[PDB]
Structure formats: structure tokens, C-alpha cells
Amino acid sequence: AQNPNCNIMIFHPTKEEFNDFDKYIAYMESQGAHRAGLAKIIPPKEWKARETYDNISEILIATPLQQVASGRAGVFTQYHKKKKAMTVGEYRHLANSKKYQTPPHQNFEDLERKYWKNRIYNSPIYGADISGSLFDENTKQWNLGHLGTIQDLLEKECGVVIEGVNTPYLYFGMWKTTFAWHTEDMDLYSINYLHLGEPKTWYVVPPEHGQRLERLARELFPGSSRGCGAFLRHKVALISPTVLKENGIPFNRITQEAGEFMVTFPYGYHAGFNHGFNCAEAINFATPRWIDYGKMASQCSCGEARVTFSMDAFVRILQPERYDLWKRGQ
Amino acid sequence: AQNPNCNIMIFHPTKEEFNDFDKYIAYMESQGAHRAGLAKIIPPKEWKARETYDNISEILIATPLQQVASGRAGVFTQYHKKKKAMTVGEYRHLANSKKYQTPPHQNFEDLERKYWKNRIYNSPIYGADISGSLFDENTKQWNLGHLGTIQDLLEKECGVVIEGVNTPYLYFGMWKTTFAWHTEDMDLYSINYLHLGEPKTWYVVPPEHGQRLERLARELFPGSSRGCGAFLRHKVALISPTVLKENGIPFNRITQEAGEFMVTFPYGYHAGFNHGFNCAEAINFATPRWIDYGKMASQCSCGEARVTFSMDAFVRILQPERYDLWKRGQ
Numbered sequence: 001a002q003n004p005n006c007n008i009m010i011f012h013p014t015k016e017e018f019n020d021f022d023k024y025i026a027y028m029e030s031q032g033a034h035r036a037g038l039a040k041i042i043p044p045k046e047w048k049a050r051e052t053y054d055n056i057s058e059i060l061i062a063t064p065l066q067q068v069a070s071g072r073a074g075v076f077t078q079y080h081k082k083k084k085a086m087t088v089g090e091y092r093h094l095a096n097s098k099k100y101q102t103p104p105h106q107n108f109e110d111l112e113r114k115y116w117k118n119r120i121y122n123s124p125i126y127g128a129d130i131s132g133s134l135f136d137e138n139t140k141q142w143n144l145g146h147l148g149t150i151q152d153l154l155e156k157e158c159g160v161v162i163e164g165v166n167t168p169y170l171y172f173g174m175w176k177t178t179f180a181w182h183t184e185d186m187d188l189y190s191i192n193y194l195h196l197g198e199p200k201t202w203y204v205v206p207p208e209h210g211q212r213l214e215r216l217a218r219e220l221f222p223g224s225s226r227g228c229g230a231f232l233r234h235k236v237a238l239i240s241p242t243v244l245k246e247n248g249i250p251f252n253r254i255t256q257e258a259g260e261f262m263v264t265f266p267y268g269y270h271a272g273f274n275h276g277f278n279c280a281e282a283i284n285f286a287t288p289r290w291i292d293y294g295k296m297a298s299q300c301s302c303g304e305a306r307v308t309f310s311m312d313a314f315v316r317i318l319q320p321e322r323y324d325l326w327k328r329g330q
Numbered sequence: 331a332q333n334p335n336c337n338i339m340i341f342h343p344t345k346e347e348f349n350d351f352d353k354y355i356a357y358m359e360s361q362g363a364h365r366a367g368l369a370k371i372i373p374p375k376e377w378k379a380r381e382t383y384d385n386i387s388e389i390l391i392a393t394p395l396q397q398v399a400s401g402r403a404g405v406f407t408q409y410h411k412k413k414k415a416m417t418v419g420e421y422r423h424l425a426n427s428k429k430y431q432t433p434p435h436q437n438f439e440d441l442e443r444k445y446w447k448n449r450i451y452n453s454p455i456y457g458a459d460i461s462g463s464l465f466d467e468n469t470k471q472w473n474l475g476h477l478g479t480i481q482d483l484l485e486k487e488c489g490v491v492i493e494g495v496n497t498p499y500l501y502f503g504m505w506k507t508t509f510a511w512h513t514e515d516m517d518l519y520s521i522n523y524l525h526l527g528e529p530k531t532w533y534v535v536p537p538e539h540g541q542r543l544e545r546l547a548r549e550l551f552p553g554s555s556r557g558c559g560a561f562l563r564h565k566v567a568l569i570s571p572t573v574l575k576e577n578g579i580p581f582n583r584i585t586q587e588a589g590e591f592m593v594t595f596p597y598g599y600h601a602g603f604n605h606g607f608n609c610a611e612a613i614n615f616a617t618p619r620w621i622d623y624g625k626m627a628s629q630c631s632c633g634e635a636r637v638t639f640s641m642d643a644f645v646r647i648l649q650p651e652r653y654d655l656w657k658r659g660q
């Protein structure tokens with residue numbers, strides 16, 4: 001078996017290999033990349049997402065989110081407090097202000113230490129889940145707005161036509177902005193491109209060990225667990241690498257820099273943080289190998305978890321026994 | 331000047347002419363098609379949207395709408411009463427039931443007479459604005475899920491990058507289901523493909539005469555006009571061809587059949603009805619010629635008009651003086 005230790009693999013496709021997206025995902029999996037839950041892909045030197053990022057300041061962040069923490073430094077939850085709308089230009093200025101700017105640091109490891117030591121004592125503001133794309137329409141390779149849709153994948157594999165659409169989202173981050181431990185909706189794949197700015201550090205648990213993370217989370221957030229059998233779907237819980245190590249949870253970490261893609265694989269739990277002002281674009285996607293994961297995906301039915309229009313058909317077709325209960329939660 | 335009488339033109343592109351969508355829209359306009367407000371395009375015989383429609387019955391209509399009329403036979407409003415969810419298979423069975431099925435009729439003109447005589451005395455159920463597509467992903471020509479986005483058009487023309495996405499919608503209709511007099515959001519173009527089933531009859535006012543329709547509507551719906559300076563944006567008012575003729579309003583009519591495209595042009599008011607069970611797909615789009623119409627588009631700020639996520643950026647960039655007032659309405 002390839003990649004038995006479940007290491008995060010890094011790929012350097014040629015421009016020829018960068019033409020057929022589906023084919024290259026399949027290639028990565030043939031080398032065992034999916035066992036880690038996360039892979040990095042560095043585009044060929046001839047490739048670019050768009051010409052420049054000089055004209056993005058007028059994009060609106062309609063609902064910036066202030067991420068307020070509760071708990072202890074290595075085990076905490078965060079809630080999202082809505083703030084007034086602001087443009088990307090205004091947001092960038094805020095990110096670089098004395099209150100919010102990245103501190104002096106020696107290297108990525110030093111900054112990681114500072115993050116886990118000090119995150120809970122600040123409340124950074126995140127510009128998340130903004131429908132849109134920064135890929136040029138003329139970019140034909142790995143354009144996240146031009147991927148095959150999940151609805152078409154389900155139709156091709158299972159023969160049923162369903163409603164729903166599948167479009168990309170933008171994320172504008174600043175120092176200490178945080179994404180909580182989660183898998184994707186319906187345990188889909190995701191792909192994330194860091195367009196511009198400072199790095200993003202990722203943590204990931206191998207899909208074959210996801211249940212170990214779930215069990216620890218139940219122990220560490222006992223009230224939350226009693227409230228919902230799938231509370232990690234709420235995307236609010238953080239556990240540090242030190243605490244994961246203390247509890248023997250298998251995981252890996254890697255830092256993504258501007259110009260790099262990350263792919264998360266079905267049922268790969270991940271979490272992470274931004275180093276400073278940046279912009280990323282992400283979208284979910286499916287392959288034939290996903291279908292079995294979709295059929296088995298846990299669901300939140302307590303009502304807390306956010307849910308897109310497209311989710312209904314996924315649950316309806318792949319999980320008909322769970323559909324009525326889930327629908328009541330929606 | 332081409333097409334000075336503003337007649338609805340019908341086009342028969344060859345398979346070669348069907349390759350470049352933008353180029354063919356520009357060609358139609360060079361022949362004066364836009365002066366009518368509406369054009370029909372019959373695809374080349376070699377073209378197909380998808381292989382079959384045999385597997386669409388499991389699509390969900392989450393919120394079917396019962397269209398309840400008030401007023402008189404030729405001048406009425408309709409409101410939408412929400413009904414329980416049903417699949418397309420269930421909806422098709424309902425459309426064909428004795429209560430809702432198309433009556434016996436001699437030809438399209440006979441059915442049109444019956445529609446305007448009897449519409450208000452029934453309340454048909456419409457499956458409208460369902461995000462999704464029935465085009466095969468391998469259909470490369472005139473695939474309504476693969477058009478250039480409005481956001482990219484605005485960026486190309488005016489140099490500013492904006493948030494937002496632009497995806498198609500499905501419409502499942504039955505006898506007497508009705509679309510009220512309206513122009514598109516921001517006076518955009520639209521394109522409509524009738525995938526399957528019974529015909530759709532359209533009425534349209536030439537863009538150069540849109541104000542004449544607005545003035546008559548103010549006279550015929552005086553309370554509505556007092557409530558909102560752009561109340562046709564609410565998409566609830568119907569005026570028959572007989573009443574339009576009585577009041578000297580220039581208009582044209584045409585019936586669309588399965589397998590045919592209709593394009594509406596900026597500020598072309600249109601209305602119409604379905605002949606029986608059918609399914610259509612539609613999306614808005616822009617060209618460089620649209621920008622001046624977008625800048626001048628009326629807006630509803632009374633709060634009634636529905637508004638997509640994408641609308642914000644359009645108003646923000648093209649109509650900054652109106653943005654604050656419009657935003658309060660949203």
C-alpha cells in the first residue's frame with residue numbers, strides 16, 4: 001500500500017499534467033496522497049491564476065466575522081460575531097493595523113508557537129464564505145470556477161439528475177483568523193488556492209483515523225457532544241497540536257504559501273490559521289471514490305450546522321433513511 | 331436602421347455559427363433583433379442539450395408556488411402561496427390531473443383566448459427559480475451553465491473586480507402558470523431554453539417603448555404605484571394583449587416550443603404563460619452594450635422585490651448614488 005504512514009505529499013505537475021484535473025487527482029491517489037487527508041500541489045512555472053491582484057480592493061465583505069474564543073489556550077471554541085460591511089481595501093488596512101498585524105517572528109515554527117500561546121486572548125476578524133472567484137476566465141487549467149459539478153458527478157455515477165449548483169468561495173484572512181476542526185459537507189473533497197498574501201498553516205488527521213479525533217472531541221467538549229451527535233459539523237472547536245500529541249491522535253501539519261493549491265480528501269479532518277492578510281479561494285468537488293463516503297457521512301440534525309441549497313439532494317438520494325430527521329434540523 | 335418596426339426576429343444558426351455565443355448575440359443585434367426586446371433562436375439540427383429527459387423525475391421542487399389572481403380577466407395581480415415540497419414526477423402527475431390539465435383546443439390562438447378569458451378563475455402551481463441545470467456537461471455550444479459571467483463582463487469593461495456568482499435556474503410549469511410583466515434585474519439580458527413539454531407564449535414591449543408600458547401600469551394599478559416607484563419589479567402585474575391594444579401600447583407576441591431558445595434584451599418588458607407541463611432553464615447575462623442600461627436601471631427600494639446576492643455589487647458600482655437607499659430596502 002502506498003503512503004502507509006499517511007504523510008502529506010507534495011506534487012509538482014508539469015504543464016502537460018496540469019491539463020486534466022480529474023486525471024491528476026486520480027494520479028495523486030494512486031500514489032497514496034489521500035491517506036494523509038491533505039495534499040499540496042505546486043502549479044507549473046508557466047501557470048498563473050490571473051494577471052495581477054491590483055484591482056481587488058472594491059470587493060465587498062458584506063458580513064465580516066469577529067472570532068471570539070472561550071476555553072483554554074489549547075482547547076477552545078470560537079463564536080462568530082457579525083460586524084458591519086467593509087471593502088477588501090478597508091479590511092486589508094485593518095489587518096495591517098497595530099491591533100491586528102502579525103507580530104515579529106523568526107520563522108513559521110516561531111509564529112505557530114505564538115499562535116497557540118496567544119490566540120484566545122484576541123478576536124481577529126475574518127472575511128469568510130464570500131461567493132465569487134478571482135480566477136481569470138481565460139485560465140483554463142485548475143480554474144476553481146470551471147470544475148465539473150458535484151451534481152453532474154452524482155448523475156454520472158448513480159444515474160439520477162438532481163437540482164443544485166456548486167460555485168467557489170473567497171476567504172479574506174488576517175493574523176490569527178482560524179478555521180476549526182471539520183470535514184467537508186457530506187465528506188466531500190475540497191480544493192483551496194491561496195491567491196495572495198501571507199501563509200496559511202494546516203493541521204490534518206488521516207481519514208482512516210478520523211474517529212479517534214471525534215472521540216477526543218467528545219471528551220474535551222462534553223456539553224457540546226451531549227447537544228449534538230455530530231457537533232464538529234458546527235465548525236467551532238479547536239484542539240492544539242500539543243493536546244493532540246498528548247492524546248496520541250495521529251495528525252500532520254504543513255504551511256501553504258501564496259500560489260499553492262491544497263486538496264482535502266473525503267473525511268480528512270482539518271483545522272488551521274492565517275499568518276497575516278491573505279486571500280484564498282475554495283470549492284468542494286467529488287470523484288467516483290467519494291460516493292461511498294457521502295453515503296456514510298455523519299449529519300448534524302440539531303439545527304446549528306449551516307447548510308447550502310445543494311445539500312438537500314445529497315442527503316435525499318444518498319441517505320434516504322436520515323433525510324426526514326435531517327430536514328427537520330434544517 | 332435595422333428592424334425599425336421592432337418585430338420579433340427568428341434565427342437559424344448553422345453548427346459553425348453556434349460555436350461562439352457572444353459573437354452570435356452581436357450578430358443578431360447587427361440585424362436589429364434587440365429592437366423587439368425578444369428573439370427566438372432555433373439550434374442547428376446537429377445540436378442537442380442532453381441525451382434524454384428520462385431521468386429527471388427525482389428533482390425536488392422545494393417550494394412550489396400557487397399563483398392566486400385578483401382583479402379582472404385582462405388586468406390582474408397574482409400572489410404566490412407556498413405549497414409543500416414535491417418531486418418533478420409528482421408535479422408532472424399533478425399538472426396532468428383533471429383539475430390542472432390543458433383543455434381541448436384547436437391551435438395556439440384558441441388556447442391564448444382561453445387563457446385570457448379564464449386565467450383568473452384558477453390557481454395553477456408553478457415550480458420556479460430552482461437553482462440547477464439540465465444541460466449535459468459535454469454540450470459545448472449554448473450551454474447555459476457555461477456562459478461568461480456578468481461579474482467577469484463588468485470587470486472586463488470597467489476594470490473592477492467584484493464578488494458574486496451567476497448560475498442557471500429551472501422552471502417547471504403547467505397550464506395557466508404565468509410570468510408577470512417585468513424586465514430583468516438591473517435590466518440584464520436573459521436567455522431561456524425550453525427543455526421539454528408543452529409550449530410557452532411570450533409577450534414583449536420594445537425597449538424603446540418601455541416607458542409607455544410603465545405609464546399604463548401606473549394607471550391600472552394605482553395603489554401599487556403609490557407604494558413603490560418601480561412596482562413592476564415585484565413581478566406580480568398582468569395586462570392582457572387586448573388591454574395593451576386598447577391603450578395603444580406597442581408589443582409583440584410569439585410562442586416558444588420545446589428545443590428552442592429565447593433571448594430577452596436589456597429593458598425589454600415581457601410576460602407570458604405555459605400551455606401545459608414543461609421545463610425551461612434560464613440565466614441572466616451581459617454584453618458591453620448592457621452597461622449603459624445597468625447604469626440607468628430603475629430600482630425597487632420598498633423592500634418587496636426579491637434580490638440575489640449578486641445584485642449588491644451591480645448597484646454599488648454602477649449606481650453609487652442609489653446604493654444606500656436601495657440597501658435599506660434589502
Ligand SMILES: O=C(O)c1ccnc(C(=O)O)c1
Pocket residue numbers: 128171178179184190192200270280
Ligand atoms: O478558512 C479557510 O481557509 C478554510 C480552510 C479549510 N476549510 C475551510 C472550510 O470552510 O471548509 C475554510
Ligand SMILES: O=C(O)c1ccnc(C(=O)O)c1
Pocket residue numbers: 458501508509514520522530600610
Ligand atoms: O417563468 C418563465 O418561463 C420566465 C420567463 C421569463 N422571465 C422569467 C423571469 O423570472 O425573468 C421567467
Ligand code: NI
Pocket residue numbers: 182183184190264270
Ligand atoms: Ni474545509
Ligand code: NI
Pocket residue numbers: 512513514520594600
Ligand atoms: Ni424574465
Ligand SMILES: [Zn+2]
Pocket residue numbers: 227228229230231233234300301302303304305
Ligand atoms: Zn448539531
Ligand SMILES: [Zn+2]
Pocket residue numbers: 557558559560561563564630631632633634635
Ligand atoms: Zn417595491
